[PDB]
Every structure is written in structure tokens, then in C-alpha cells.
Tab-separated table of C-alpha atoms in Angstrom:
chain	number	residue	atom	x	y	z
A	1	UNK	CA	-6.709	16.321	-13.272
A	2	UNK	CA	-6.601	19.171	-15.794
A	3	UNK	CA	-7.625	18.826	-19.434
A	4	UNK	CA	-6.750	21.521	-21.967
A	5	UNK	CA	-7.136	21.654	-25.735
A	6	UNK	CA	-6.028	24.123	-28.392
A	7	UNK	CA	-6.566	24.126	-32.152
A	8	UNK	CA	-4.113	25.507	-34.665
A	9	UNK	CA	-5.340	26.275	-38.180
A	10	UNK	CA	-2.596	25.113	-40.549
A	11	UNK	CA	-4.076	26.972	-43.539
A	12	UNK	CA	-3.693	30.352	-41.790
A	13	UNK	CA	-0.988	29.695	-39.184
A	14	UNK	CA	-3.297	31.263	-36.603
A	15	UNK	CA	-5.376	29.627	-33.845
A	16	UNK	CA	-8.857	28.378	-34.769
A	17	UNK	CA	-11.526	30.269	-32.761
A	18	UNK	CA	-15.135	29.359	-31.896
A	19	UNK	CA	-14.700	25.601	-32.394
A	20	UNK	CA	-16.948	23.364	-30.269
A	21	UNK	CA	-15.199	20.613	-28.304
A	22	UNK	CA	-16.987	17.814	-26.459
A	23	UNK	CA	-15.297	15.930	-23.605
A	24	UNK	CA	-16.444	12.364	-22.890
A	25	UNK	CA	-15.653	9.466	-20.550
A	26	UNK	CA	-15.909	5.770	-21.431
A	27	UNK	CA	-18.505	4.101	-19.200
A	28	UNK	CA	-20.106	0.645	-19.104
A	29	UNK	CA	-20.522	3.683	-24.316
A	30	UNK	CA	-19.350	7.291	-23.993
A	31	UNK	CA	-20.804	9.993	-21.709
A	32	UNK	CA	-20.418	13.792	-21.780
A	33	UNK	CA	-18.442	15.399	-18.974
A	34	UNK	CA	-18.312	18.881	-20.524
A	35	UNK	CA	-18.711	20.894	-23.735
A	36	UNK	CA	-16.649	24.001	-24.553
A	37	UNK	CA	-15.764	26.376	-27.390
A	38	UNK	CA	-12.237	27.510	-28.291
A	39	UNK	CA	-11.526	31.183	-27.529
A	40	UNK	CA	-9.754	33.947	-29.532
A	41	UNK	CA	-6.452	32.115	-29.012
A	42	UNK	CA	-8.028	28.787	-30.026
A	43	UNK	CA	-7.837	27.419	-26.473
A	44	UNK	CA	-10.017	25.717	-23.905
A	45	UNK	CA	-7.760	25.910	-20.830
A	46	UNK	CA	-10.005	24.024	-18.385
A	47	UNK	CA	-12.163	21.452	-20.132
A	48	UNK	CA	-12.402	19.807	-17.344
A	49	UNK	CA	-11.206	22.290	-14.671
A	50	UNK	CA	-8.740	21.172	-11.963
A	51	UNK	CA	-10.585	18.381	-10.108
A	52	UNK	CA	-9.942	14.755	-9.107
A	53	UNK	CA	-10.794	12.195	-11.802
A	54	UNK	CA	-11.070	8.432	-12.252
A	55	UNK	CA	-8.486	6.738	-14.499
A	56	UNK	CA	-9.621	5.240	-17.809
A	57	UNK	CA	-10.438	6.039	-21.428
A	58	UNK	CA	-11.506	9.549	-22.387
A	59	UNK	CA	-12.435	11.292	-25.640
A	60	UNK	CA	-12.442	14.821	-27.047
A	61	UNK	CA	-14.488	15.554	-30.161
A	62	UNK	CA	-13.380	18.608	-32.137
A	63	UNK	CA	-16.400	19.910	-34.078
A	64	UNK	CA	-14.190	20.981	-36.994
A	65	UNK	CA	-16.757	20.083	-39.668
A	66	UNK	CA	-18.995	22.931	-38.502
A	67	UNK	CA	-15.909	25.164	-38.291
A	68	UNK	CA	-14.991	24.817	-41.989
A	69	UNK	CA	-18.659	24.998	-43.030
A	70	UNK	CA	-18.934	28.516	-41.568
A	71	UNK	CA	-15.817	29.507	-43.546
A	72	UNK	CA	-17.350	27.920	-46.682
A	73	UNK	CA	-14.438	25.470	-46.922
A	74	UNK	CA	-14.556	21.773	-47.807
A	75	UNK	CA	-13.022	19.211	-45.430
A	76	UNK	CA	-12.439	15.439	-45.157
A	77	UNK	CA	-13.675	15.263	-41.564
A	78	UNK	CA	-17.249	15.822	-40.294
A	79	UNK	CA	-15.610	16.101	-36.852
A	80	UNK	CA	-12.362	14.948	-35.234
A	81	UNK	CA	-12.523	12.555	-32.262
A	82	UNK	CA	-9.398	11.946	-30.165
A	83	UNK	CA	-9.360	8.969	-27.788
A	84	UNK	CA	-6.864	9.013	-24.920
A	85	UNK	CA	-6.150	7.061	-21.723
A	86	UNK	CA	-5.249	8.612	-18.367
A	87	UNK	CA	-3.528	6.500	-15.705
A	88	UNK	CA	-1.881	9.366	-13.813
A	89	UNK	CA	-4.935	11.421	-12.843
A	90	UNK	CA	-2.885	14.062	-10.994
A	91	UNK	CA	-1.441	15.586	-14.165
A	92	UNK	CA	-2.327	18.444	-16.514
A	93	UNK	CA	-3.073	17.048	-19.987
A	94	UNK	CA	-2.854	19.096	-23.187
A	95	UNK	CA	-4.490	17.586	-26.279
A	96	UNK	CA	-3.726	20.034	-29.137
A	97	UNK	CA	-5.039	19.733	-32.690
A	98	UNK	CA	-3.064	20.802	-35.756
A	99	UNK	CA	-5.882	21.349	-38.222
A	100	UNK	CA	-5.831	21.188	-42.003
A	101	UNK	CA	-8.846	20.668	-44.282
A	102	UNK	CA	-7.836	17.127	-45.318
A	103	UNK	CA	-5.344	16.144	-42.602
A	104	UNK	CA	-4.463	16.650	-38.940
A	105	UNK	CA	-2.124	15.889	-36.050
A	106	UNK	CA	-2.756	15.364	-32.342
A	107	UNK	CA	-0.534	14.453	-29.388
A	108	UNK	CA	0.091	14.870	-25.666
A	109	UNK	CA	1.240	18.479	-25.304
A	110	UNK	CA	1.790	17.217	-22.647
B	1	UNK	CA	-15.717	3.116	-53.610
B	2	UNK	CA	-12.360	1.817	-52.369
B	3	UNK	CA	-11.085	2.274	-48.823
B	4	UNK	CA	-7.446	1.600	-47.959
B	5	UNK	CA	-5.464	2.181	-44.781
B	6	UNK	CA	-1.792	1.853	-43.893
B	7	UNK	CA	0.024	2.422	-40.606
B	8	UNK	CA	3.554	3.719	-40.305
B	9	UNK	CA	5.405	3.230	-37.021
B	10	UNK	CA	7.298	6.468	-36.367
B	11	UNK	CA	9.463	4.915	-33.630
B	12	UNK	CA	10.948	2.372	-36.070
B	13	UNK	CA	10.408	3.998	-39.477
B	14	UNK	CA	8.885	0.715	-40.641
B	15	UNK	CA	5.234	-0.215	-41.279
B	16	UNK	CA	3.183	-1.442	-38.310
B	17	UNK	CA	2.016	-5.051	-38.899
B	18	UNK	CA	-0.860	-7.044	-37.365
B	19	UNK	CA	-2.886	-3.998	-36.278
B	20	UNK	CA	-6.673	-4.463	-36.171
B	21	UNK	CA	-8.735	-1.852	-38.021
B	22	UNK	CA	-12.516	-1.546	-37.806
B	23	UNK	CA	-14.519	0.198	-40.544
B	24	UNK	CA	-17.871	1.750	-39.595
B	25	UNK	CA	-20.714	3.729	-41.176
B	26	UNK	CA	-22.828	6.365	-39.418
B	27	UNK	CA	-26.466	5.242	-39.343
B	28	UNK	CA	-29.627	6.566	-37.678
B	29	UNK	CA	-24.915	5.451	-34.055
B	30	UNK	CA	-22.098	3.629	-35.854
B	31	UNK	CA	-22.273	0.198	-37.535
B	32	UNK	CA	-19.498	-2.186	-38.633
B	33	UNK	CA	-18.995	-2.683	-42.356
B	34	UNK	CA	-15.741	-4.650	-42.057
B	35	UNK	CA	-12.816	-5.532	-39.782
B	36	UNK	CA	-9.261	-6.125	-41.041
B	37	UNK	CA	-5.662	-6.492	-39.862
B	38	UNK	CA	-2.657	-4.702	-41.377
B	39	UNK	CA	-0.266	-6.986	-43.286
B	40	UNK	CA	3.571	-7.239	-43.358
B	41	UNK	CA	3.693	-3.874	-45.144
B	42	UNK	CA	1.245	-2.348	-42.642
B	43	UNK	CA	-1.542	-2.143	-45.235
B	44	UNK	CA	-5.183	-3.046	-45.650
B	45	UNK	CA	-5.637	-2.432	-49.392
B	46	UNK	CA	-9.364	-3.220	-49.628
B	47	UNK	CA	-11.190	-2.430	-46.407
B	48	UNK	CA	-13.953	-2.129	-48.085
B	49	UNK	CA	-13.175	-3.729	-51.488
B	50	UNK	CA	-14.199	-1.966	-54.730
B	51	UNK	CA	-18.010	-1.706	-54.493
B	52	UNK	CA	-20.672	1.016	-54.746
B	53	UNK	CA	-21.317	2.905	-51.498
B	54	UNK	CA	-23.725	5.467	-50.055
B	55	UNK	CA	-22.336	8.939	-49.278
B	56	UNK	CA	-22.070	10.048	-45.646
B	57	UNK	CA	-19.938	9.838	-42.514
B	58	UNK	CA	-17.586	6.902	-42.029
B	59	UNK	CA	-15.080	5.866	-39.359
B	60	UNK	CA	-11.942	3.738	-39.110
B	61	UNK	CA	-10.743	2.627	-35.684
B	62	UNK	CA	-7.056	1.719	-35.481
B	63	UNK	CA	-6.608	-0.734	-32.589
B	64	UNK	CA	-3.182	0.718	-31.758
B	65	UNK	CA	-3.576	0.291	-27.988
B	66	UNK	CA	-3.424	-3.491	-28.383
B	67	UNK	CA	-0.515	-3.041	-30.811
B	68	UNK	CA	1.753	-1.268	-28.292
B	69	UNK	CA	0.632	-3.592	-25.479
B	70	UNK	CA	2.043	-6.602	-27.361
B	71	UNK	CA	5.346	-4.719	-27.758
B	72	UNK	CA	5.257	-3.858	-24.022
B	73	UNK	CA	5.193	-0.133	-24.836
B	74	UNK	CA	3.149	2.597	-23.151
B	75	UNK	CA	0.879	4.829	-25.255
B	76	UNK	CA	-1.509	7.793	-24.861
B	77	UNK	CA	-4.227	6.198	-26.992
B	78	UNK	CA	-6.327	3.099	-26.163
B	79	UNK	CA	-7.231	3.149	-29.877
B	80	UNK	CA	-7.289	5.731	-32.674
B	81	UNK	CA	-10.615	6.563	-34.357
B	82	UNK	CA	-10.634	8.562	-37.602
B	83	UNK	CA	-13.923	10.084	-38.777
B	84	UNK	CA	-14.243	11.013	-42.450
B	85	UNK	CA	-16.965	12.067	-44.904
B	86	UNK	CA	-17.337	10.752	-48.456
B	87	UNK	CA	-19.370	12.725	-51.003
B	88	UNK	CA	-17.682	11.352	-54.128
B	89	UNK	CA	-18.356	7.628	-53.720
B	90	UNK	CA	-16.595	6.693	-56.978
B	91	UNK	CA	-13.104	7.378	-55.632
B	92	UNK	CA	-10.330	5.365	-53.981
B	93	UNK	CA	-9.713	6.703	-50.461
B	94	UNK	CA	-6.463	6.209	-48.543
B	95	UNK	CA	-6.574	6.937	-44.805
B	96	UNK	CA	-2.976	6.442	-43.561
B	97	UNK	CA	-1.862	6.653	-39.934
B	98	UNK	CA	1.528	7.986	-38.853
B	99	UNK	CA	1.862	6.327	-35.468
B	100	UNK	CA	3.871	7.411	-32.449
B	101	UNK	CA	3.289	6.320	-28.840
B	102	UNK	CA	1.992	9.732	-27.697
B	103	UNK	CA	1.066	11.417	-30.992
B	104	UNK	CA	-0.184	10.745	-34.518
B	105	UNK	CA	-1.133	12.129	-37.922
B	106	UNK	CA	-3.849	11.154	-40.392
B	107	UNK	CA	-4.992	12.549	-43.745
B	108	UNK	CA	-6.462	11.754	-47.154
B	109	UNK	CA	-3.676	9.906	-48.972
B	110	UNK	CA	-5.718	10.501	-51.077
C	1	UNK	CA	19.817	2.760	-53.038
C	2	UNK	CA	16.454	4.171	-54.138
C	3	UNK	CA	15.141	7.583	-53.101
C	4	UNK	CA	11.501	8.520	-53.652
C	5	UNK	CA	9.492	11.543	-52.566
C	6	UNK	CA	5.813	12.445	-52.770
C	7	UNK	CA	3.959	15.573	-51.674
C	8	UNK	CA	0.417	15.623	-50.369
C	9	UNK	CA	-1.465	18.927	-50.317
C	10	UNK	CA	-3.381	19.013	-47.033
C	11	UNK	CA	-5.558	21.956	-48.121
C	12	UNK	CA	-7.001	19.966	-51.053
C	13	UNK	CA	-6.436	16.341	-50.011
C	14	UNK	CA	-4.885	15.756	-53.434
C	15	UNK	CA	-1.222	15.311	-54.429
C	16	UNK	CA	0.813	18.461	-55.118
C	17	UNK	CA	2.009	18.490	-58.764
C	18	UNK	CA	4.881	20.374	-60.442
C	19	UNK	CA	6.875	20.938	-57.238
C	20	UNK	CA	10.665	21.153	-57.650
C	21	UNK	CA	12.724	18.903	-55.374
C	22	UNK	CA	16.504	19.099	-54.998
C	23	UNK	CA	18.520	16.122	-53.726
C	24	UNK	CA	21.845	16.820	-52.001
C	25	UNK	CA	24.691	14.949	-50.297
C	26	UNK	CA	26.770	16.256	-47.386
C	27	UNK	CA	30.415	16.545	-48.447
C	28	UNK	CA	33.551	17.991	-46.834
C	29	UNK	CA	28.815	21.712	-47.363
C	30	UNK	CA	26.028	20.225	-49.487
C	31	UNK	CA	26.246	19.146	-53.150
C	32	UNK	CA	23.499	18.445	-55.715
C	33	UNK	CA	23.033	14.853	-56.834
C	34	UNK	CA	19.792	15.454	-58.749
C	35	UNK	CA	16.851	17.820	-59.257
C	36	UNK	CA	13.315	16.653	-60.090
C	37	UNK	CA	9.706	17.847	-60.276
C	38	UNK	CA	6.694	16.036	-58.800
C	39	UNK	CA	4.343	14.513	-61.392
C	40	UNK	CA	0.510	14.454	-61.690
C	41	UNK	CA	0.378	12.126	-58.674
C	42	UNK	CA	2.794	14.357	-56.731
C	43	UNK	CA	5.604	11.789	-56.934
C	44	UNK	CA	9.253	11.559	-57.860
C	45	UNK	CA	9.736	7.770	-57.884
C	46	UNK	CA	13.475	7.699	-58.661
C	47	UNK	CA	15.266	10.759	-57.331
C	48	UNK	CA	18.046	9.063	-57.286
C	49	UNK	CA	17.303	5.983	-59.451
C	50	UNK	CA	18.343	2.500	-58.246
C	51	UNK	CA	22.149	2.718	-57.916
C	52	UNK	CA	24.798	2.029	-55.253
C	53	UNK	CA	25.395	4.916	-52.837
C	54	UNK	CA	27.771	5.927	-50.051
C	55	UNK	CA	26.346	6.096	-46.511
C	56	UNK	CA	26.040	9.486	-44.801
C	57	UNK	CA	23.886	12.596	-44.505
C	58	UNK	CA	21.552	13.548	-47.338
C	59	UNK	CA	19.030	16.337	-47.931
C	60	UNK	CA	15.903	16.916	-50.014
C	61	UNK	CA	14.682	20.472	-50.550
C	62	UNK	CA	11.000	20.797	-51.437
C	63	UNK	CA	10.544	24.058	-53.369
C	64	UNK	CA	7.100	24.603	-51.832
C	65	UNK	CA	7.450	28.394	-51.618
C	66	UNK	CA	7.346	28.643	-55.413
C	67	UNK	CA	4.455	26.149	-55.402
C	68	UNK	CA	2.145	28.314	-53.249
C	69	UNK	CA	3.259	31.488	-55.057
C	70	UNK	CA	1.887	30.133	-58.353
C	71	UNK	CA	-1.425	29.394	-56.593
C	72	UNK	CA	-1.376	32.932	-55.112
C	73	UNK	CA	-1.339	31.504	-51.576
C	74	UNK	CA	0.674	32.722	-48.584
C	75	UNK	CA	2.948	30.291	-46.719
C	76	UNK	CA	5.312	30.197	-43.715
C	77	UNK	CA	8.057	28.380	-45.621
C	78	UNK	CA	10.177	29.738	-48.517
C	79	UNK	CA	11.110	26.079	-49.086
C	80	UNK	CA	11.172	22.888	-47.011
C	81	UNK	CA	14.509	21.116	-46.443
C	82	UNK	CA	14.548	17.585	-45.018
C	83	UNK	CA	17.834	16.192	-43.691
C	84	UNK	CA	18.183	12.419	-43.392
C	85	UNK	CA	20.918	9.842	-42.734
C	86	UNK	CA	21.337	6.567	-44.629
C	87	UNK	CA	23.374	3.741	-43.096
C	88	UNK	CA	21.725	0.878	-44.989
C	89	UNK	CA	22.419	1.913	-48.586
C	90	UNK	CA	20.700	-1.159	-50.067
C	91	UNK	CA	17.190	0.026	-49.199
C	92	UNK	CA	14.415	1.973	-50.927
C	93	UNK	CA	13.758	5.214	-49.022
C	94	UNK	CA	10.492	7.160	-49.215
C	95	UNK	CA	10.564	10.721	-47.866
C	96	UNK	CA	6.959	12.006	-48.181
C	97	UNK	CA	5.810	15.536	-47.368
C	98	UNK	CA	2.395	16.347	-45.908
C	99	UNK	CA	2.050	19.961	-46.971
C	100	UNK	CA	0.008	22.742	-45.408
C	101	UNK	CA	0.558	26.487	-45.876
C	102	UNK	CA	1.817	27.051	-42.309
C	103	UNK	CA	2.760	23.524	-41.199
C	104	UNK	CA	4.057	20.171	-42.438
C	105	UNK	CA	5.022	16.590	-41.640
C	106	UNK	CA	7.769	14.343	-42.992
C	107	UNK	CA	8.929	10.809	-42.170
C	108	UNK	CA	10.443	7.597	-43.516
C	109	UNK	CA	7.687	6.097	-45.671
C	110	UNK	CA	9.741	3.932	-45.420
D	1	UNK	CA	10.349	40.220	-33.297
D	2	UNK	CA	10.235	37.253	-30.911
D	3	UNK	CA	11.295	33.728	-31.854
D	4	UNK	CA	10.424	30.771	-29.634
D	5	UNK	CA	10.851	27.040	-30.135
D	6	UNK	CA	9.744	23.996	-28.161
D	7	UNK	CA	10.313	20.293	-28.782
D	8	UNK	CA	7.869	17.562	-27.873
D	9	UNK	CA	9.120	13.976	-27.691
D	10	UNK	CA	6.411	11.820	-29.264
D	11	UNK	CA	7.904	8.571	-27.924
D	12	UNK	CA	7.479	9.724	-24.301
D	13	UNK	CA	4.756	12.382	-24.545
D	14	UNK	CA	7.026	14.678	-22.535
D	15	UNK	CA	9.094	17.689	-23.659
D	16	UNK	CA	12.593	17.016	-25.017
D	17	UNK	CA	15.222	18.700	-22.786
D	18	UNK	CA	18.835	19.719	-23.507
D	19	UNK	CA	18.429	19.866	-27.298
D	20	UNK	CA	20.679	22.355	-29.120
D	21	UNK	CA	18.934	24.746	-31.512
D	22	UNK	CA	20.731	27.046	-33.951
D	23	UNK	CA	19.033	30.166	-35.340
D	24	UNK	CA	20.194	31.477	-38.725
D	25	UNK	CA	19.409	34.270	-41.191
D	26	UNK	CA	19.704	34.026	-44.980
D	27	UNK	CA	22.292	36.527	-46.225
D	28	UNK	CA	23.921	37.215	-49.600
D	29	UNK	CA	24.359	31.569	-47.482
D	30	UNK	CA	23.156	31.270	-43.882
D	31	UNK	CA	24.569	33.079	-40.821
D	32	UNK	CA	24.156	32.365	-37.088
D	33	UNK	CA	22.140	34.846	-35.051
D	34	UNK	CA	21.995	32.729	-31.884
D	35	UNK	CA	22.402	29.229	-30.438
D	36	UNK	CA	20.329	27.885	-27.531
D	37	UNK	CA	19.443	24.679	-25.682
D	38	UNK	CA	15.921	23.564	-24.741
D	39	UNK	CA	15.170	23.698	-21.002
D	40	UNK	CA	13.395	21.247	-18.630
D	41	UNK	CA	10.103	22.041	-20.379
D	42	UNK	CA	11.720	21.616	-23.814
D	43	UNK	CA	11.504	25.346	-24.571
D	44	UNK	CA	13.672	28.180	-25.796
D	45	UNK	CA	11.387	31.162	-25.105
D	46	UNK	CA	13.623	33.908	-26.538
D	47	UNK	CA	15.824	32.635	-29.345
D	48	UNK	CA	16.041	35.673	-30.499
D	49	UNK	CA	14.808	37.869	-27.603
D	50	UNK	CA	12.325	40.705	-28.274
D	51	UNK	CA	14.174	43.019	-30.696
D	52	UNK	CA	13.553	44.616	-34.108
D	53	UNK	CA	14.446	42.396	-37.075
D	54	UNK	CA	14.759	42.589	-40.856
D	55	UNK	CA	12.208	40.640	-42.926
D	56	UNK	CA	13.380	37.637	-44.956
D	57	UNK	CA	14.231	33.944	-44.770
D	58	UNK	CA	15.278	32.416	-41.462
D	59	UNK	CA	16.224	28.921	-40.285
D	60	UNK	CA	16.214	26.938	-37.042
D	61	UNK	CA	18.286	23.763	-36.821
D	62	UNK	CA	17.170	21.291	-34.159
D	63	UNK	CA	20.196	19.179	-33.178
D	64	UNK	CA	18.004	16.112	-32.630
D	65	UNK	CA	20.597	13.638	-33.932
D	66	UNK	CA	22.812	14.334	-30.918
D	67	UNK	CA	19.703	14.141	-28.711
D	68	UNK	CA	18.816	10.546	-29.681
D	69	UNK	CA	22.494	9.517	-29.645
D	70	UNK	CA	22.730	10.364	-25.929
D	71	UNK	CA	19.621	8.228	-25.314
D	72	UNK	CA	21.194	5.416	-27.395
D	73	UNK	CA	18.300	5.565	-29.874
D	74	UNK	CA	18.458	5.319	-33.669
D	75	UNK	CA	16.926	8.082	-35.809
D	76	UNK	CA	16.373	8.986	-39.483
D	77	UNK	CA	17.571	12.569	-39.035
D	78	UNK	CA	21.134	13.755	-38.241
D	79	UNK	CA	19.461	17.082	-37.399
D	80	UNK	CA	16.207	18.845	-38.292
D	81	UNK	CA	16.361	22.179	-40.151
D	82	UNK	CA	13.226	24.325	-40.432
D	83	UNK	CA	13.189	27.172	-42.960
D	84	UNK	CA	10.670	29.974	-42.456
D	85	UNK	CA	9.937	33.446	-43.855
D	86	UNK	CA	8.999	36.489	-41.768
D	87	UNK	CA	7.268	39.453	-43.414
D	88	UNK	CA	5.581	40.822	-40.287
D	89	UNK	CA	8.608	41.453	-38.067
D	90	UNK	CA	6.519	42.820	-35.178
D	91	UNK	CA	5.093	39.425	-34.220
D	92	UNK	CA	5.976	36.632	-31.791
D	93	UNK	CA	6.767	33.451	-33.746
D	94	UNK	CA	6.557	29.949	-32.268
D	95	UNK	CA	8.232	27.169	-34.263
D	96	UNK	CA	7.479	23.934	-32.336
D	97	UNK	CA	8.824	20.491	-33.221
D	98	UNK	CA	6.866	17.275	-32.694
D	99	UNK	CA	9.704	14.777	-32.553
D	100	UNK	CA	9.689	11.075	-33.355
D	101	UNK	CA	12.728	8.937	-34.215
D	102	UNK	CA	11.756	8.501	-37.888
D	103	UNK	CA	9.248	11.328	-38.419
D	104	UNK	CA	8.331	14.851	-37.321
D	105	UNK	CA	5.970	17.807	-37.603
D	106	UNK	CA	6.575	21.555	-37.490
D	107	UNK	CA	4.329	24.603	-37.911
D	108	UNK	CA	3.673	28.199	-36.882
D	109	UNK	CA	2.496	27.938	-33.272
D	110	UNK	CA	1.925	30.767	-34.071
């Protein structure tokens, strides 16, 4: 199992650097597996480095509220959580974020 | 304060009906204010009917996992949470969801 | 046949007013049916007012380059064209635009 | 100047292969610079291979209508054109497409 994220700032058309991202797993609420920060190219390649994982519900929380605060920009979102389910645990999963101040998009990248 | 949501199925180009949506407020974790289901036109007009509200972080959870399950369709998301912050509590807030099986978009509508 | 558009500024979370939109039909290249400008609520309700229409390929061009220029903002797009096909000419068609400086989304609204 | 595109099928969460993409430049209408087809990973890495280019308005046309037709799926779009402007001709430009049947997203990737 590999989990990658990358954030794209839609206001600038450039990647969003230094954004905190929290990875969680749904247990019998949610529990932290890892916490990372997006690099110069707005990426966290191994979130989650290549290791075996149990299937089930996962979550990434993009700390984008703190990101816009440091730029002195207003935003609709205090943070952006993305819930996803993994049944094929062998695969590399990309969960990108297309970030605007008052809107966003996310998907399997794959 | 007014809170509305509407879901648009991107596979069909038609609204997504009968989808459960849970509205929550961040307290000193999260607490349910109301639970609704999208109508024939994929809307929940008053989520949250017109009443005074305290500023702070809110959340809507679109139960889209159960939606695709009833259509016998696979999806990346077990559900879709959307976190948002309200500072101007006088306003009508639209939080629409553009729904695909393995991707989505959300925004202030406004 | 009814054709509506509305533009949502993702930087502000408010509708985008005064944006020129050109409606075209594919002929044996493209030909202008109508030209409108988005109102205070970022809408052009009747683009295209309620009248019978021939099925086929249509196009709306959102003059968003001129929009950002008047705000002194840079953008990736000189304008945003959206091609769509209508087979059911009886229906009301919404073609909304979720507008960021360096990214956008469009869909049937319906 | 480098121009890359990649298409992501939002219905499947996998890249969209074998999709024709036409690259054009705005002249004193539009003129074809190159035509490519997306590979197994839904990419056209060099659209446009690394060569010097003149600044101005460009266009990529994603032949997504023909794509869904071969899958026997209905779609709102006969094809998807994306207009973009390049002022810094030294840079590598990614223009990805997040593809659903009745909706899509595009952006600088960068």
C-alpha cells in the first residue's frame, strides 16, 4: 500500500507548499497513522510509505485553513478532510487536492 | 443563518435523490444539529432552517457511499465530509456537491 | 429549450458579475445565437430564452479573461469555452462555471 | 516550452486511455500544431515536445465524445476544448482533465 497526496493552488496555478496533512484510519473513531507536510512541489510522496495495510476506511486531513492564514487570505474551510475506502491494499493511491479559497476538488489520481 | 445543500450526479447529469446528509457543529468533537435526505431535485433547502447561529466550524457529511451501494456502483468514498467555517452568521450558505464515483467537487454556492 | 449559465468565483465564494458569455451553434464552424452578461448574482437565466431548438452541438464561451483583467488578476485562460450536445431539446439546461484563476469546473446543472 | 496532458476517468478512478487530443495555436482562427492519443496511463507527455514557442493563446481539444461512444456511454460533451494563455514560454505546462460523463475539471498542473 502506498498513499500519496499533492495540493495544487488554483489561485496561483502552482503547487501549495508547507501544508500539513494528517493520515488517519477508521477504528472501532479515527486514529493517526502519520502526519506530513507538502514539499516545494506540493507533494507528500509516501504518507504512508510502501507497506502492507488492512482494508477499510481511511482519511486525509489537509490543514489548508492554516495555509491561507499564513498568506493572510480568507477561506471557507478551516481544514479539508477527505474520506476514502481501500479494498485493494496492494495499490498506490494518489489523493490530490485542487485548492481554491472557497472551493475544491479531490479524486483518485489514481 | 440558512444552510442548504444539493448533490449533482456527474455520471447522469441529473440530481442525486435520497442521499442522507448529516449536519454537525464543532464543540469542545463534532455534534449533530440535524440530519436530512436530498429530495427529487437532490436538494435539502433548509438543513438548518432560517435561525440564528453561533459562528465557528461546521461540517456536512454526504452519505454517498450508501447512495452508490443501492445503485450497485463502486466508489472511492465511504462518505463525503465537508468542513466549513461561518463568521457571518446572517447569511444563506449553499454547500453543493458535484458527485462522481471516484472524485468530487464542493464550494460555497454561495 | 432553455439555456442558463451562472459563474461562481472560487477566490471570493461569491458569484462573478458582469462576465460576457457568448452562445454558439455548430453549423456546416460555429455561429452566434446570443450574447449576454452575467448579472449581480452571476447568472444569465435565459441565454437562449424558452424556444424550440434543433438538436446538435452547442458552445458557450465565458469571457473570463476580460473579467480577471478588470480586477488586475492574472489567469491561465484567455476565455473559457464549453462545448455541449443537446439531444432532448425540450429540457432546461444549466451550464454553470466554477471559476478560479488557474482552474475551473463545468457540468450539467442540470 | 513543454506541453503535457493527462485524463483521469472519474467514473472508474483510473486513467482514460486512447483519447485523441488536438493541440492548436491562435493565429490571425486556430491552427493545429500537433495531434496525440493518451497512452495506457492516460498521458501525452510531450504534446508539443520540448522546443521554443511563441507566447499567446493556445487550445487543447480532448476528443472525449468519441471516447464515451466506444464505451457505449452517454455524455454531455461532444468534445472538451481547453483554452489557455502562455506568457512564460520557458516552462513545462500540464493541462490535466478530470473526466466525468456530464461534468469535468481542468487546471494548470502546473
